[PDB]
Amino acid sequence: AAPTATVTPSSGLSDGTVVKVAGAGLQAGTAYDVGQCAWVDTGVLACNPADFSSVTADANGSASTSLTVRRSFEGFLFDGTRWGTVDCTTAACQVGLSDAAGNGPEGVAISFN
């Protein structure tokens, strides 16, 4: 019941744009791994190398974590293989945290409003 973890701005397509990501109704007192994950390869769900940033939302599911949106970088497929891309300007990169359950409910496709 909220926008969850989302970057302040919208045009995430900014040379490693540093902003704050507020997570409303997110990990209600829980914690996860914040990062921009998305299909990097041919529909292959690959996370960025900077998508590794522990996160924790207050009991009020308030995960106000700040990080940089490094659209450019070496992506890695979730399957097990690594891609790279270098520039995640093609596939919308979703900035969010991952659950320890094996799901990707959180993640805002940042890049362009």
Ligand X SMILES: COc1cc(C)c2ccc(O)c(C(=O)O[C@H]3[C@H](O)C=C[C@@H]3O)c2c1
Q: How far is CA 34 from CA 27, 42, 59, 95, 108, in A?
A: 11, 23, 17, 7, 11
Q: Using the rule CB under 6 A, is 19 a contact of ligand X?
A: no
The minimum distance between CB 107 and ligand X, in angstroms, equals 3
Q: Using the rule CB under 6 A, is 100 a contact of ligand X?
A: no
Residues that contact ligand X, how many (by CB under 6 A)? 16
* CB 102, CB 69: distance < 8 Å: no
Q: Which of 23, 35, 61, 75 binds ligand X (CB under 6 A)?
A: 35
Residues within window 71-90 making contact with ligand X, judged by CB under 6 A: 78
Q: How far is CA 100 from CA 87, 103, 113, in A?
A: 27, 8, 29
3-state helix, strand, coil in the chain (%, to 5): 0, 45, 55
Q: Using the rule CB under 6 A, is 61 a contact of ligand X?
A: no
Residue ranges that bind ligand X, judged by CB under 6 A: 33, 35, 37, 45, 47, 51, 78, 94, 96-98, 102-104, 106-107
